Amino acid sequence: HWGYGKHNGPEHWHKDFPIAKGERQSPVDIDTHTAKYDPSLKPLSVSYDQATSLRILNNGHAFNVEFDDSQDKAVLKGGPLDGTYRLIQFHFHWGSLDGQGSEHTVDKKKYAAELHLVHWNTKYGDFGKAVQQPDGLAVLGIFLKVGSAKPGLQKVVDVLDSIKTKGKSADFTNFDPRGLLPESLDYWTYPGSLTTPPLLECVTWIVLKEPISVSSEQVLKFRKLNFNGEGEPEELMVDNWRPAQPLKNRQIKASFK
Numbered sequence: 001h002w003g004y005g006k007h008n009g010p011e012h013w014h015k016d017f018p019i020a021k022g023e024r025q026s027p028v029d030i031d032t033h034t035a036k037y038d039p040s041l042k043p044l045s046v047s048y049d050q051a052t053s054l055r056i057l058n059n060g061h062a063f064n065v066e067f068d069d070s071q072d073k074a075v076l077k078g079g080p081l082d083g084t085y086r087l088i089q090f091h092f093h094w095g096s097l098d099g100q101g102s103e104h105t106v107d108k109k110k111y112a113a114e115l116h117l118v119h120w121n122t123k124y125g126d127f128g129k130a131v132q133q134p135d136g137l138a139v140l141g142i143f144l145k146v147g148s149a150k151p152g153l154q155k156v157v158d159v160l161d162s163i164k165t166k167g168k169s170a171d172f173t174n175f176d177p178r179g180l181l182p183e184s185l186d187y188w189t190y191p192g193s194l195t196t197p198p199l200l201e202c203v204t205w206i207v208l209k210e211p212i213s214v215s216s217e218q219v220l221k222f223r224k225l226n227f228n229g230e231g232e233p234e235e236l237m238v239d240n241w242r243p244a245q246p247l248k249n250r251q252i253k254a255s256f257k
């Protein structure tokens, strides 16, 4: 299977997932000078008032906080999007060190981690059908920098010792993902892909300009998770990010001047 090790990391993924070398791969470097302000972009609409978290899962590559997406209860709209996208899960990517971990970069700067809120276009009925479409998904990306704690993150960090290893899950109800957002919803957007296999080219990326602040202690607890299963040689879950991919003349658009 693919992963983030020496032998099965991002430079290997093309051998089983040839779209790895495609025309709309993610993540990318965001060259802030080349991204054009688009005054036709709308404010993003994040409506998470009724979000229903269910469970947290260590899938062997990250942890996913899963949501009940059987009704329109946590949706993203507006911004560059046509239509309504339902939140299905969020997860992060992070580094072994604070100097690396994010997947998108900004003028080649790497943040310590990046949060992805994954949503699917309700016109396609469910997530598995949406990932077959070029406008199937909208992923809201938020950078994390190390500084002051994010109080809304702490319930996620507190549960991680219960899902240390691959395949472990834990009930995770009543979690409010609004506590993970920054103040501003200014963003960049471009067309791209899932950043892990199967690397499908189905995502409208919406990357917020303003990072959130998490504490050193918060991110250290992410780095105590394991890629391995219980009873297996410990391999710390660190450096589960794909590096920036060729932009291939796509345009990155800014919502702000």
Ligand SMILES: NS(=O)(=O)c1cc2ccccc2s1
Pocket (backbone or CB within 6 Å): 001, 002, 003, 007, 008, 009, 012, 013, 014, 015, 016, 017
């Ligand atoms: N990264 S991958 O192309 O999916 C992959 C599968 C795989 C299996 C055994 C050893 C290395 C790799 S690399």
Ligand SMILES: NS(=O)(=O)c1cc2ccccc2s1
Pocket (backbone or CB within 6 Å): 116, 118, 139, 193, 194, 195, 196, 197, 198
């Ligand atoms: N990292 S991501 O592009 O947000 C992502 C979401 C996602 C969902 C199902 C399977 C693979 C991936 S990879």
Ligand SMILES: [Zn+2]
Pocket (backbone or CB within 6 Å): 091, 092, 093, 116, 195
């Ligand atoms: Zn991701």
